[PDB]
Amino acid sequence: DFDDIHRKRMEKDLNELQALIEAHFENRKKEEEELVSLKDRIERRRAERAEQQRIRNEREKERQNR
Amino acid sequence: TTALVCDNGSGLVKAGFAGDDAPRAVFPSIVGRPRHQGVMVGMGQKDSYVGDEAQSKRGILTLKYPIEHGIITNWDDMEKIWHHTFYNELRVAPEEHPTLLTEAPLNPKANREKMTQIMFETFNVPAMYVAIQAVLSLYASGRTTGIVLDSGDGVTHNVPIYEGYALPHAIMRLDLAGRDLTDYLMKILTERGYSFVTTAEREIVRDIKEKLCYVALDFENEMATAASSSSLEKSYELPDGQVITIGNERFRCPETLFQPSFIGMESAGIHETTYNSIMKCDIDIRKDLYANNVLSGGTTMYPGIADRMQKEITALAPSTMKIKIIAPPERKYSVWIGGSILASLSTFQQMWISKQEYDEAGPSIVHRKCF
Amino acid sequence: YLMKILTERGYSFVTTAEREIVRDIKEKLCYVALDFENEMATAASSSSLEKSYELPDGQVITIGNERFRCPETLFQPSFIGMESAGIHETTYNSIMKCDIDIRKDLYANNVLSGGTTMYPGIADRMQKEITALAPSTMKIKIIAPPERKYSVWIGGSILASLSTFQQMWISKQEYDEAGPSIVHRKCF
Amino acid sequence: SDKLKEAETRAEFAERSVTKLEKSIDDLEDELYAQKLKYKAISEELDHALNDMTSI
Amino acid sequence: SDKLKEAETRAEFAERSVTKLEKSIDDLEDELYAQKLKYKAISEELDHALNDMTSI
Ligand SMILES: Nc1ncnc2c1ncn2[C@@H]1O[C@H](COP(=O)(O)OP(=O)(O)O)[C@@H](O)[C@H]1O
Ligand SMILES: [Mg+2]
């Protein structure tokens, strides 16, 4: 007894810390930069949609104005 | 086959198969009947939501715990809780599995006898054994001596053990626990304007207590600091908005543990009942008990309690002895981990109360040699 | 109230038959303003709001700022002398009387029904008002199905078509045994 | 005449409403992106912290 | 009749546009609110970490 405390504690004392650091690094890398880039891309597409909407609205208002 | 290590507790039922690291299913032990009328037809409305289901529909229920202080006050609800635990959270029929319940020290006999009678007649288990909640917490620490303070949610008890020989004359059981701290916090929150009354809002106050409260290292200095600066005021968002700000209620709620005069209890705090429990022991094992003080149970998870308790005991104890407080990070499930270890032992395999033995001596078998 | 404020331009409707004409005017022209003061200021300067309508005999009429003042009474019942608060604040009061744990769900599932909730632009005014009253974190959503007028009857058809409901009817023999006061009993 | 007056009127209301809806949509989306970018900046703060923690 | 047909079709198209825009708004709102709650939670746990550091 009291000799399995080493073999159940020291293991996770380093392996768990290193593995969680690895998980955090990979999750941040996968998540943050890709999300910001994708949001910028969607913003550009949204601006293009806004331009198309403005053009169509203006041309239809020009024709229909009677 | 494998054994079922159930642990009734009072506030959270923890269960799982023997031989693992953590309980498989942990869920509050509340059974709440609906209280309003109900107009939708065919909605499939049941008559009682138990376990974790009633913590999501708690807006229209009247939750009521079936275990008050260790003892069980409402046997039908407890039977319902056990049935749910076996069939829906573990999905193993009890006809093929031994069970290992846990019970607080110094509890009424009738409670234990009724528990074994239920387990043998209704659920019809092959064999069940009842163990004291502190010996298991001592198993989990991997020790064999030490005095364990198991401050659960129902009752706080302090069982000293040396070399495997428990000292029955030195058990100090005190009925202040997490539930009384919840009620006292709910009572002192009214000093700022927030009124929680419904039995559903007791859960919200419990969440506030868990997430914000902490034990002060020195009480008077904290009371003076919180009354001048504002560095302590932490805010918290209710289940509907309207954030609240807790001031010096943060460390006043768990201070009740060390000064039970706050809620009107006469007895001394958990810092002095441990010293009294030690002093009742023999003069030659006091050093070992001083050096191996063990904490367990949920309520001992307050941030900063393992230092306050050590400071208090060092103040009380003689100056030469070394005071050490074992506070493992897996405190909450310490009793259940110990239960799993005990159920996994080969030497223990012949201590179960076999069903034929119960058939021959009745429910009073539990007080006999098979303890 | 619309029939009473139309008199400010010269049109007098008195007969109980002409109440139907005023009702038709209300249905076809009135709308709920998103912001009341801005609309009152705009209608008093420009003339982009004045919509005309042809009576059952000719003599077209022009409704000015009476358009959004008639249905504004819903949110300010002080116009017709009623004391109580508008439909924007009795909903919030009805929510706040409920328990503290089901307020989020009620906030998110506010349902509109009935005929009078068909005014163009009410599902936005009500949402703005409740969002002003409610805590900033909760999400306020207002369900306004296009079949609002017959919503009660569609629900009635669904309820009558259920199999589970088939034994809740007040059978005639039951009425013969307990009299008309049977309705307050278990068969509600 | 009644029918087409009704239709054009309700259509005009629809157009104004939908344009207001589009302004709402864009504001909500852009605010969402700003908040998400703040969150990712916080995530990279945490990731720098994790790189420090690589000390373990 | 011709004006009626064209007006009705324009109306129906705009109406369906309205409904779809509302649905999109609802979904983006749910996601943005979930992100908001995530942010509040991360900040709160960060502060708890800070107070844990204060303790030790
Ligand atoms: N992280 C925490 N911080 C403070 N108090 C806690 C925490 N977790 C649980 N508690 C308190 O402990 C109680 C749960 O104790 P528990 O050990 O489950 O009791 P039992 O012995 O009946 O299982 C809860 O009611 C709660 O008040
Ligand atoms: Mg316990």
Determine the distance in angstroms separating the CA of D55 from the nearest CA of chain E, rounded to an integer: 18
Q: Whose CA is nearest to atom 18 of ligand 1?
A: B12
| Close Cβ partners of B315 (under 8 Å, ≥ 6 residues apart) | none
- Structural domain including B198 reads 178-256
Q: What DSSP letter does each residue of C75-111 carry, written as one string?
A: T-TTTTT--S--HHHHHHHHHHTS-TTSHHHHHHTEE
| B133 shares a domain with B12 | yes
Q: Whose CA is nearest to atom 20 of ligand 1?
A: B9
Mark yes or no for CB contact D44/A35 under 8 Å: no
Tokens of C13: 């409707």
- The count of other CB atoms within 10 Å of the CB of residue C20 is 12
Name the residue with tokens 């916080």. Answer: D42
Q: Could you tell me the distance, in angstroms and rounded to a whole number, from the CA of residue B220 to the centre of ligand 2?
A: 31
| B133 shares a domain with B10 | yes
| B204 shares a domain with B110 | no
C188: helix, strand or coil? coil
B242-251: burial string, b at 16+ Cβ within 10 Å, e else: eeeebebbbb
Spatial distance between the Cα atoms of B128 and B5, rounded to a whole number of angstroms: 10
Mark yes or no for CB contact E28/D31 under 8 Å: no
Give CA torsion, residues B69, B70, B73, B78, to 10 deg. Answer: 130
In chain C, how long is the greatest CA-to-CA distance?
70
Atom of ligand 1 nearest to the CA of B7: 23
- The count of other CB atoms within 10 Å of the CB of residue A22 is 12
Angle (nearest 5°) at CA B77 between B43 and B81: 80
In SS3 terms, B265-334 reads as CCCCCHHHHHHHHHHCCCCCCHHHHHHCEEEECHHHHCCCHHHHHHHHHHHHCCCCCCCCEECCCCCCCH
Q: Which residues in chain D touch residue E29, judged by CB atoms under 8 angstroms apart?
A: 28
Q: Could you tell me the distance, in angstroms and rounded to a whole number, from the CA of residue E49 to the centre of ligand 1?
A: 20
- Interface check for C164 against chain B (CB to CB < 8 A): the answer is yes
Contact in structure between D49 and A20 (CB atoms under 8 Å): no
Contact in structure between B43 and B103 (CB atoms under 8 Å): no
Closest CA to B80 of B33, B18, B17: B33
- Interface check for D28 against chain E (CB to CB < 8 A): the answer is yes
Q: Which residues in chain B touch residue C97, judged by CB atoms under 8 angstroms apart?
A: none
Strand partners, C61: C53
For the Cβ of B157 lying below 6 angstroms from any atom of ligand 1, the answer is no
Contact in structure between B186 and B209 (CB atoms under 8 Å): no
- Interface check for E4 against chain D (CB to CB < 8 A): the answer is yes
Closest CA to B298 of B244, B352, B335, B248: B335
Q: Which residues in chain A touch residue B146, judged by CB atoms under 8 angstroms apart?
A: none
Question: What CATH number has the domain bearing residue B10?
Answer: 3.30.420.40
- Interface check for B44 against chain C (CB to CB < 8 A): the answer is no
- Chains C+A touching (3+ CB pairs under 8 Å): no
For B344-351, which contacts have Cβ atoms below 8 Å and span 24 or more sequence positions? B344/B3, B344/B18, B344/B19, B351/B129
Spatial distance between the Cα atoms of B69 and B51, rounded to a whole number of angstroms: 19
A1: helix, strand or coil? coil
Tokens of B54: 């009633």
Determine the distance in angstroms separating the CA of E52 from the nearest CA of chain B, rounded to an integer: 8
| B187 shares a domain with B121 | no
Spatial distance between the Cα atoms of B212 and E43, rounded to a whole number of angstroms: 14
| B182 shares a domain with B133 | no
Question: What CATH number has the domain bearing residue C3?
Answer: 3.90.640.10
Mark yes or no for CB contact D47/A29 under 8 Å: yes
Resolution, in Å, please?
Answer: 5.6
| B133 shares a domain with B9 | yes
